[PDB]
Amino acid sequence: MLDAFAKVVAQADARGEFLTNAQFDALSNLVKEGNKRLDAVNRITSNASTIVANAARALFAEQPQLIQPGGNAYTNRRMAACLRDMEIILRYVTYAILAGDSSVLDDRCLNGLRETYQALGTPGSSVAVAIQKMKDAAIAIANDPNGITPGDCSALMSEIAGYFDRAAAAVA
Amino acid sequence: MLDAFAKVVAQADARGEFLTNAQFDALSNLVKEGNKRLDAVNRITSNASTIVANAARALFAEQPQLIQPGGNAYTNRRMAACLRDMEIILRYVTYAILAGDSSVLDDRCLNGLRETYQALGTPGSSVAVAIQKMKDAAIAIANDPNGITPGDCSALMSEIAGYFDRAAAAVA
Amino acid sequence: MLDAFAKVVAQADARGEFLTNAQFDALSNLVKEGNKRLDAVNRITSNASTIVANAARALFAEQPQLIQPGGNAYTNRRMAACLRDMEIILRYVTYAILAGDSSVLDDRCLNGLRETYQALGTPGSSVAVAIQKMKDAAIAIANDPNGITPGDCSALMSEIAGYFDRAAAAVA
Amino acid sequence: MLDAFAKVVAQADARGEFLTNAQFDALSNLVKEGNKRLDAVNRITSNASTIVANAARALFAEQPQLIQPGGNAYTNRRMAACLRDMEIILRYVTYAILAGDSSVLDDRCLNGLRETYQALGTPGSSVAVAIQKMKDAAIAIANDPNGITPGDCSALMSEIAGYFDRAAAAVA
Amino acid sequence: MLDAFAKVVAQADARGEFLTNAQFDALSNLVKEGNKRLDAVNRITSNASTIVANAARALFAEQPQLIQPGGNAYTNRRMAACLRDMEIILRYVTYAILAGDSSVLDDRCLNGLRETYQALGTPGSSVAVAIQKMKDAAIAIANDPNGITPGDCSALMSEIAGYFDRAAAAVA
Amino acid sequence: MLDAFAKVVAQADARGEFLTNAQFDALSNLVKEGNKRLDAVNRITSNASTIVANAARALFAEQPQLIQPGGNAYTNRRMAACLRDMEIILRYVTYAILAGDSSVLDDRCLNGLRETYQALGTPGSSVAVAIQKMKDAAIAIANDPNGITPGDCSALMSEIAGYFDRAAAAVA
Amino acid sequence: MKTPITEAIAAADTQGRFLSNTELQAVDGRFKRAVASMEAARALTNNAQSLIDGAAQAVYQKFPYTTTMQGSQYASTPEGKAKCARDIGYYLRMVTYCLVAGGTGPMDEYLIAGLSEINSTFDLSPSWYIEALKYIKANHGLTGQAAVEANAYIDYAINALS
Amino acid sequence: MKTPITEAIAAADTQGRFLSNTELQAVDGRFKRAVASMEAARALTNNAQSLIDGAAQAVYQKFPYTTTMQGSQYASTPEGKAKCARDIGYYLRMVTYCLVAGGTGPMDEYLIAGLSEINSTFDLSPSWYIEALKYIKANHGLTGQAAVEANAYIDYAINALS
Amino acid sequence: MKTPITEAIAAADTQGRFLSNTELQAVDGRFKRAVASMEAARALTNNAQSLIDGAAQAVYQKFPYTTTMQGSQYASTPEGKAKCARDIGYYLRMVTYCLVAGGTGPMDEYLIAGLSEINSTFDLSPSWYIEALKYIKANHGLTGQAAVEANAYIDYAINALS
Amino acid sequence: MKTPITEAIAAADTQGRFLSNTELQAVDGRFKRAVASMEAARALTNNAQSLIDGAAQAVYQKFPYTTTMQGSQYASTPEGKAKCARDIGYYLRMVTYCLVAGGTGPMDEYLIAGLSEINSTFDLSPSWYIEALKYIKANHGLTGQAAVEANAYIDYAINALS
Amino acid sequence: MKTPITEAIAAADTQGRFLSNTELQAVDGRFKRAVASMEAARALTNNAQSLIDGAAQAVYQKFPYTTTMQGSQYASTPEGKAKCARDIGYYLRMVTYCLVAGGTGPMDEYLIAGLSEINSTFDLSPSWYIEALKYIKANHGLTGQAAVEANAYIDYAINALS
Amino acid sequence: MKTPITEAIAAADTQGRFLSNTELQAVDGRFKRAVASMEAARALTNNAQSLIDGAAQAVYQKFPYTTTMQGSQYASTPEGKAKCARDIGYYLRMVTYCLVAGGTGPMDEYLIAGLSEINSTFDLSPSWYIEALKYIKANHGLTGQAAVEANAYIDYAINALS
């Protein structure tokens, strides 16, 4: 597992170099923006249940074959497994938003996940739809300008978007 | 693991259908024939030891290279392993005769067994000979018309034959 | 695991033969030379630490890129892992010298070691250099004519050389 | 684990005796009454959830100190643990009703249960109240004369009562 | 494990009460003093090795029978075990200084430690001497008025003293 | 585990002393007698099966209540367990004869064995009879003057007797 | 899938044993009981629609708020009623599967596994499906041992919801 | 009990390590944030009764059937209302504990563990307690970071019920 | 002890489950079959002595060397014959226990466990006890399902010796 | 394969250690004893046929029924005698392997593993092979330590059959 | 790599939990402390050469034998001094990494793991590197909390060598 | 304690086996080698003081700084020299124990276990004790196999320090 700081460290060690000002300024700026990152993580986490549910409800409205008999989300065991996967994916995304680095998302969630959905026969392209469903909902929640010190989080909201696309790209 | 009843259930659920009369009659008939199935299972099980032994004795009479030095059934550890395999195969066949379905035989015995005999270098074609040796002996025992309420078990004896050929086909 | 005696046994059993004089004489001669084999094992073992260290010191003198930042032996965790591998290899060589047979070296050290050094990205060709570094040092120590009953160990020293080349051949 | 049949067997073996008619008649009578035993087990099992709930609701009505802050059934973790114990006890009682012997109840539930409730500080005398709460409810359900072939189950209902008192005696 | 905050919480829940101002003021004051607590923990931790060593050196100067042949700290395995115990005790003390509560020290170090030193035959009274050796050294280090914002830590240094005496009281 | 040599070592270390001539002579004499010790171990081991069997046959002839229904050696599972215990005891005795010290017999067989036979209800006094049955048979075999270089083993045969009595004393 | 036969086999394959008279007695009991279970399953199947349509109303009467409140979890829309009727059918259909198979396996696999996660996620109250199961149990019109089989698996569902 | 300090210690005692600057930074963050958490806990505590009494009505208005239906699980009796008001107090009181402790531990230990078993056994709908938590969240009258702490632990409860 | 009822309970207590229709069917099959098993056990018991005395001679005829050879393992002494007759009784008595209990448990516990260790230690040939079991199986004079129960447990013994 | 050298190595490779004087002493003891083991193996090998042919008759005399009884397990046919003589050779040949290797490994691997399963399946009595081993032990014509090595591995076989 | 953030995540991913206010407080403490850690890392970096060159002499003065004794482990050759100065730089550079990352991870991964094996194999005395760390700690010219961060990670190194 | 005999027993007690010719050969090798080990142990013991006093000076000459530097880890005080001479005696005495026992056990148990922890804690350099072991190895005045035993256990110590 790496965060935005440990990543820069690991790249300097490989070259045997101390950090340069170009890097002490980039990391100092990361710190300057930490409060935004924490609001974002708090906001998405405190709406985890609604994000997954409404995203699930909409996925099954658009693709009703996932829930008819013989479908991959038919029966409660596969429905629960499906809601679980959506929760697990959103959980490792919020980890990446806090670390400022996607490493945890890759090693411990996405890596090998495409091979898994093909062994059990799950439509990864449908999982990808679910992932970008939660993306739009999470950004809406994280970037909500209400009840929070006004400011620009556009850069942050773009980074958050990268983690979701990274996940939906790894399964589709 | 599935039996003849759970199999029909699993096929209706996939289509989301209640059972039709065509299936309530097929399963009711299966029940009508249960006593025959139990005699067959009892008869083969109570002669397991003689079935394996006489089948082993005959396999090594026809293929004496399996037991000469350097042979795959040479030494007591490989002889025992061989008698064991014969017993294990006959054991999962009698399971299938009771379940009316080969699923247990496939998942828990035959599946992957061909790859195993090729890794250790065992003649699967000789195992296949052993399996149809026990088949003829078991049917003889199961279909013995003596000391049992007379009737037709020809359909049953054919099903039993299918399980043995299924096993000898998976190793040969 | 086999030794020079168990190997000959295993080859007779495969043909179902008692041993012949040609083999009772070869094995009796092996016994005649046992004292030399024990001096050799004792001498290499009692200089294990210096063999690995001086061999490591020289490997990193000739290939200083293994120890500069980004190198496979950079940091103490990879340096230690490297000294460890050198010690582990020398340890299974001394096992083979005592058994008079390379089986233990193959099954429990070399087999699969090439695939391992390619997964983690280690230069197996550098490991091979290290192995023949210890070879020359160990033979020097084992064949030292000082403080020991004079005699010919040239045959033994050649066998010992075979175990090292076998190891350096399996990684290079 | 013993049932009414295995118990009689174990007592004959200790004396090395075949069974006498006095015992072949007692065990044959047990069989004659098996249908009643199965109705009883079915009836209590199919009302397990209501038995435990209504019994819990009444225990906490009579002893409201178990559920006020600082009480042993305060917080949801201890409430659940308490409902669980009630379910576990009723579960091993229904096992004894089917076996016609209390052995399973003793070895696998009651034995050591008094020592457990004193280590964690639970009022075993309150557990005993809960147990006889379920007893009266279960007998009411098992002995309900409605929707069932009329007959005398008074002997059975007395045996069932013995298992509950045995449990409430072991904790009180 | 409890800290000064979780302890107050656990005591309110037992009575079912919200916190009173008397407690919101005590806990707010604890926070006011947190910086001192962190300096203390940092200072003792960064001198752990010297604390244990000098304390060990002095214990064996005063009680040279612990290290003569037959002594409980004779041989390197018992010397190391002894230095280890001193390090482990100092480690759970620094945990208590950070938590503001001795619970972790009791459950995970001291509880059962007296019974352990009597089974293996270690002089607990000597362990107690070692513990108050580290106490005086740690307080000296933690309360050093040099290179730190001047202020009163006398209350803190007394709490720290309580954890050491608690440990030396549990073994002596 | 200790042998006659490691025992003397452990006693010198406790006093911090080098060995004295009184001990270099005692241990040198032990070596002088090693061949006798090896014949004894070989002779008892190569008759293990007959020792246990004939000893078992005689124990059950003298105490026929151990094998009548309800007896502790009744049924094949308790008979086998009994023959097993006799074999296990004789096995740790032959270990002590080779080590010249009873430590292995005490730590790994006898210690706690009395408490075990009282929990399961076995007559330890009968086990003691079995143990001295094997003693007389083993000494007869070990001290047989036939087919072996003549000499005095009376001292050895007395030591062997001590190990058996030690075992029969620990259970009786 | 948990049936009397797969349990009998599972008990033998667990201990490495061939089947024995101990297990064959267990299957003979299944084959015998099948006569009463079949005619129960046939009846529930033939009157499945009236039992679903009546079970739905028993629920909408007991809990009228489910037809007037706003929310995708309620039956206040035509799509919500379709979903409810569907779910009630699912429960009844699993009861027939359990009778045909001779055990809880069908319901265990297809319905009970994950029930708590789904009922919570989608804010479906178990009280609703128990009421629908109580209506079926009272009105399936079975008598004798056919009714004992039906109620056995209907109560088993109810206990899973409680 | 899960607090920032017990986690920092747990992380060290797990790896056999002394504390380090890695862990002390974590506790400094607790000590700093405590200023905003305390004044939130003080406020919720001082206005606890009006927040419970208003939260109870928010529920009885949203789900009016809980005041008219028969059953010990409903608030249609004076004893049932007492029980409901009690439970709502329990939730609020755990929120204050979480603010005082600096983490979820209090709520995890005393409330969330066993919640699903109890809510099912006693046929209590989670929708009720979420509505009561939504009313507190809207009307606690906190602003700034004091409000961020309160809602953090109120939403954490709501997610445990969802 | 392995009976149809202890297996049914064991299968439930294993998965943490209450009993179900799956297990009760298994016991109903035991209670039904008991009628045929009982009359088999009664018959073997009433003619136990003639079956033991005939079984002993079937052995001494097939393997006459057991009556003439020297050794405590043989029946060439009056004490050895007593031992043999005793062992044959043991086998028959376990068969009755298996019929009374409804499964192999009695024989599994009291006889089969340790059989190979004892038969080897004391140099008792399994061929002897199989011949005695074959004589009982042929001459027990049972017919119909009473005979199916007896032979089921006699063949089970024979397979344990093979 | 279990020899003095593979044990010495196994003991070191187990603890992660290089060899030590502890293990080299163990192999020096093998190299020394080899002189007595070799001449034993040479002798048994050179007189192997007379020892097998005499061992076979010792068995047919002690247990004459093996030459007259019907059954594929007996030596009452020319094929059965060939099989018996073969098996006796196998035992003798494993004894020589054990002497050449310096330990039980050869016999452990090639003969003792599975002995009980085979001797039971094929109804071969261990008493037969022990008698053949007792005849070899008495008539191998070895003296001194060569005889101590031979009997050590012959008795080891006998104990495996007992 | 052990940082305050990876620990906070690790603690959550361990228990299967989403992040909570418990963990976010821990990271806020990192972000705050970063201001003091950064300016420490910047200073050590800008004066890195004078601190290495002075640290090397502090060692050669305290242990003068390292400059006169023969052996590749000593600084008595120009290549040996280069190696020593290199190692001292390594230690200082890891201290800056630890300040930038907010924890011991960099030093744990790249330096402390394997330290005892290397220092023993190559006969490097820990006393040397502690003296070099003591010289840096005294002369880095930091004040206030910037100095508290530097010494925290320098003492952490020293304790790893002790 | 690791001796040739406890290993031979341990190898048997591990596999549940009686001793065999495989293990007895291993002990015969111990009993034989004992003649050369004993006279080595006797010699080292009789000349133990001159070997310790000479070994101490070999160290103080090679590393003269140990007699002039300040610190409780050095021999610059009369108490420090006593400690050093004591430690050197300890090493020699363990070598004699290893010869008497026939293996590394004595040194493994009493000296090597914990060596790295102690040598680090007390800042004792392994180079010192290796130099003292090299002086003993050169000057013990043994010849032939008595010297091979001594150096075997002295080099074993040296490798433990390297």
Ligand SMILES: *C(C)[C@H]1/C(=C/c2[nH]c(/C=C3N=C(/C=C4\NC(=O)C(CC)=C4C)C(C)=C\3CCC(=O)O)c(CCC(=O)O)c2C)NC(=O)[C@@H]1C
């Ligand atoms: C006392 C038990 C009886 C007895 C023993 C005895 N033996 C010897 C001589 C020898 N014994 C052995 C035995 C072994 N050495 C080994 O390495 C092994 C295992 C592989 C064994 C079993 C040997 C080799 C000898 C020397 C050669 C020989 O045959 O003499 C003696 C004489 C004393 C001595 O040590 O030489 C004795 C007394 N003899 C009796 O009369 C006792 C009944």
